[PDB]
């Protein structure tokens, strides 16, 4: 089960008629190339060891395409400005997500193309890779133009063609990952006593903790999953119980790197 994605951002500046264009490329949610128009001589750079085998021509070509896209974001920010009647000299962001998901056979599961403006959903390609979904009126004018010009056939050819092929090259140049949550519950006298279920050092980031012996609805205390910074992640989920009847609730952790869900307490 694999994936490739490019995440793109252009950000408009006051006075400087040219925006800052940053472009990151991921394989299996891991960074491997990055472009930042604010570098002195802007170029794609490897972000991982296995990219450094790709030779000079790769970097030349992809850098040229980065520059093409940059120009495209310039034009589209500029137009968006008019679509929404935004004042001159503001700051505005245009973003794009694109790429493809492969099944475990290395076949295409799904192709993805989305655009957002000012951090809001603007327009997106449906999973059929033929039609579009527009968020507001501006975006429908977009939608309308694109479906009249058949741009979807272009993006569909990319997602079914080069995105899969090149992902295959990349995978070959890279056959599986996971780390399991080491876990434990801590005790914290409220005024009553809090029980914090801890999950540490796991990868990937997706995980479910819950308390229980019926599924413990809420008064759930949880944090968004967070990176230890070593490549692993952390998360906890607490519940406030009064004294002594700790030994009545249960923490369970669900992670794909576990032989089986952990069932924890004390």
């Amino acid at each position: 089960p694999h994936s490739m994605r490019y995440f793109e951002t252009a950000v408009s500046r006051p006075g400087l008629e040219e925006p800052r264009y940053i472009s990151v490329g991921y394989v299996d949610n891991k960074e491997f190339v990055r472009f930042d128009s604010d570098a002195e001589n802007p170029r794609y750079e490897p972000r991982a060891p296995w990219m450094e085998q790709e030779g000079p021509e790769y970097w030349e070509r992809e850098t040229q395409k980065a520059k093409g896209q940059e120009q495209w974001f310039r034009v589209s920010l500029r137009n968006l400005l008019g679509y929404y009647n935004q004042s001159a000299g503001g700051s505005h962001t245009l973003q794009q997500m694109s790429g493809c998901d492969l099944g475990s056979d290395w076949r295409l599961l799904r192709g993805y193309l989305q655009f957002a403006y000012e951090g809001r959903d603007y327009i997106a390609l449906n999973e059929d890779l033929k039609t579009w979904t527009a968020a507001d009126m501006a975006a429908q004018i977009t939608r309308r133009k694109w479906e009249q010009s058949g741009a979807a056939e272009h993006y569909k050819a990319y997602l079914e063609g080069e995105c899969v092929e090149w992902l295959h090259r990349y995978l070959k140049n890279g056959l599986l990952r996971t780390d399991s949550p080491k876990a434990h519950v801590t005790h914290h006298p409220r005024s009553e006593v809090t029980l914090r279920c801890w999950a540490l050092g796991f990868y990937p980031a997706d995980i479910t903790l819950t308390w229980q012996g019926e599924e413990l609805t809420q008064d759930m205390e949880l944090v968004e999953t967070r990176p230890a910074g070593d490549g692993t992640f952390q998360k906890w989920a607490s519940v406030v119980v009064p004294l002594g009847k700790e030994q009545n609730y249960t923490c369970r952790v669900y992670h794909e790197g576990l032989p089986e869900p952990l069932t924890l307490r004390w």
Binding site: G68, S98, W146, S149, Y155, W166
Partner: peptide, 9 residues
Amino acid sequence: YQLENYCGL
């Protein structure tokens, strides 16, 4: 291998 856009927004 980056996508190259077609029609602008």
